[PDB]
Design a protein around this ligand. Structure first.
Ligand SMILES: CCCCCCCCCCCCCCCCCC(=O)OC[C@H](COP(=O)([O-])OCC(O)COP(=O)([O-])OC[C@@H](COC(=O)CCCCCCCCCCCCCCCCC)OC(=O)CCCCCCCCCCCCCCCCC)OC(=O)CCCCCCCCCCCCCCCCC
Ligand SMILES: Cc1cc2nc3c(=O)[nH]c(=O)nc-3n(C[C@H](O)[C@H](O)[C@H](O)COP(=O)(O)O)c2cc1C
Ligand code: SF4
Lengths: 430, 55
């Protein structure tokens, strides 16, 4: 297969994504979930890890790390300390509104994902670190977890297997940095959400000092569907090492913004012009696309012609995918004001722990606040580039990287627009 | 350069040279003591880009 996209409805993992079906447990067994779970639990952790490693599932939270090798770090015997599968549900990524759909509309799929993933590595309990702003989704998920306990599916003797397993929900309090896995671990412990330093990885020392895997809602909720439908079925889609399906979040200057599931290697032009009803003004009106949420460098209209919306083709497009959030920016958009507002986001959402992020993101926002008005000289462009090259790779987590990357993409693809901005500043203010 | 032409000619004869063209006493030909404000140039490493000090 070389032609990708146009995914059928019978291969969609996410049935009832839109909210048109009953999300509760008697409606969840009508859609295939919580079915043949005991025969999953009684094949050991190693068969589950083999069906994840065979499936080619990669990280859906912004990292792109492979899921099976990640969970195989936790396949070690205990030494008096328990283990925890914590599901990252923070979803502070601008553009990305997909895990909100998974929690709000398929909560029992998430709970079954928690149970199967905790079986996969021998975890004792589960924490769903939902966002504090998603309070309706939190109560929705808690009603579903109550319906999970009141059937015998989780808790004491989960699904009739002799495997005890809790599921908790911890709410955030409005911090984007709690989306990162080590700061999420620090946020469960009741402290400031400031990220840990690796090593020690969470697979050795995670939450409370216990071995812990923090995994996204999307990469957790699809894994019982992987184990039921088949690992070769799930690896049969997408290109090589880019398998699976993906919940794309098309927002911005489109006619119909949408959260929609599509095969992994879909062309971006095909995705926008099919599932969103086209860019406002048409494809000729397209200026740029922020491809995968705020932490990815934007791609202009010449790159949006042929590129495939998986990890490796966007690496060849010298950008990233991450959470696959297509923020569409037409020709009527002031691109510099949009990127400056996004850097304002990154300075109002940054925990302030270590020096390069804490100083460089505020300093880049001051430089971008001068670039919008044009209040500079063009020799400060590449200097700002060096500022990004003094942030990228010298921080603790990838929020410094995720704040350096949009400025790098903006400069590298729209340098002469900045130069004409500053020369028209120079002519009309002096 | 206030000497009259008889003393000036006697002095040019006794020196054997031409003295009023090259006077050692200074007059209006010098610079003015009140100068315009200068704007000195900067060094070559006053650049906001490629200013890594190890290079
Ligand atoms: C020989 C005897 C002396 C003759 C007088 C003389 O040589 O006058 C200088 C006169 C001009 O000298 P200079 O080198 O051109 O200097 C002019 C001053 O810069 C220009 O001088 P100034 O601009 O300063 O003008 C004022 C000045 C003017 O100075 C004079 O008038 C000279 C003094 C005259 C007496 O007067 C003073 O400074 C006050 C003089 C106080 C001293 C008086 C001495 C008296 C001596 C006898 C008693 O010399 C000549 O003309 C050559 C000699 C001529 C002799 C003629 C026969 C006698
Ligand atoms: C600044 C920053 C914000 C992040 N926000 C989220 C988030 O909101 N939701 C999420 O699932 N992962 C987020 N991540 C990615 C996590 O660090 C980590 O990759 C994720 O919790 C689990 O990875 P996975 O995709 O393999 O499951 C963020 C990472 C960074 C650096
Ligand atoms: S670079 Fe920024 S986001 Fe990361 S640990 Fe430091 S303050 Fe936190």
């Amino acid at each position: 297969k070389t032609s990708f996209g146009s995914l059928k409805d019978e291969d969609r993992i996410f049935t009832n994504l839109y909210g048109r079906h009953d999300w509760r447990l008697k409606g969840a067994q009508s859609r295939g979930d919580w079915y043949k779970t005991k025969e999953i639990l009684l094949k050991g952790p190693d068969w589950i890890l083999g069906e994840v490693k065979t499936s080619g599932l990669r990280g859906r939270g912004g990292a792109g790390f492979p899921t099976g090798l990640k969970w195989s770090f936790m396949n070690k015997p205990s030494d008096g300390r328990p283990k925890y599968l914590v599901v990252n549900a923070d979803e502070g990524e601008p553009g990305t509104c997909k895990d909100r759909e998974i929690i709000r509309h398929d909560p029992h799929k998430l709970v079954e994902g928690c149970l199967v993933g905790g079986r996969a590595m021998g975890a004792r309990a589960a924490y769903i670190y939902i966002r504090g702003e998603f309070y309706n989704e939190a109560s929705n998920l808690q009603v579903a977890i109550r319906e999970a306990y009141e059937a015998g599916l989780i808790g004491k003797n989960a699904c009739g297997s002799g495997y005890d397993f809790d599921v908790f929900v911890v709410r955030g309090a409005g911090a984007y940095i709690c989306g990162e896995e080590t700061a999420l671990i620090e946020s469960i412990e009741g402290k400031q959400g400031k990220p840990r330093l690796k090593p020690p990885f969470p697979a050795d020392v995670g939450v409370f000092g216990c071995p812990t895997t923090v995994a996204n809602v999307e990469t957790v909720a699809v894994s019982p569907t992987i184990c039921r439908r088949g690992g070769a079925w799930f690896a049969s889609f997408g290109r090589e090492r880019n398998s699976g399906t993906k919940l794309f979040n098309i927002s911005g200057h489109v006619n119909n913004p949408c959260t929609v599931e599509e095969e992994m290697s879909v062309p971006l032009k095909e995705l926008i012009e099919k599932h969103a009803g086209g860019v406002t003004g048409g494809w000729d009106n397209l200026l740029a696309v922020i491809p995968g949420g705020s932490s990815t460098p934007l791609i202009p209209k010449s790159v949006c012609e042929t590129v495939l919306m998986d990890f490796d083709a966007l690496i060849q497009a010298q950008t990233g995918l991450g959470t696959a959030a297509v923020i569409v920016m037409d020709r009527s958009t002031d691109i510099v004001k949009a990127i400056a507002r996004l850097i304002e986001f990154y300075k109002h959402e940054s925990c302030g722990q270590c020096t390069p992020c804490r100083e460089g993101v505020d300093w880049m926002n001051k430089v971008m606040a001068r670039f919008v008005r044009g209040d500079a000289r063009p020799a400060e462009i590449d200097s700002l580039w060096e500022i990004s090259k003094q942030i990228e790779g010298h921080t603790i987590c990838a929020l410094g990287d995720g704040a350096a990357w949009p400025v790098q993409g903006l400069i590298r693809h729209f340098r002469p627009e900045l130069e004409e901005r500053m020369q028209r500043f120079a002519q009309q203010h002096q | 350069a206030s000497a009259t032409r008889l003393i000036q000619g006697l002095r040019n004869w006794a020196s054997g040279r031409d003295l009023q063209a090259k006077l050692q006493l200074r007059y209006q030909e010098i610079s003015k003591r009140t100068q315009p404000p200068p704007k000195l140039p900067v060094g070559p490493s006053h650049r906001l880009s490629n200013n890594y000090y190890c290079a």
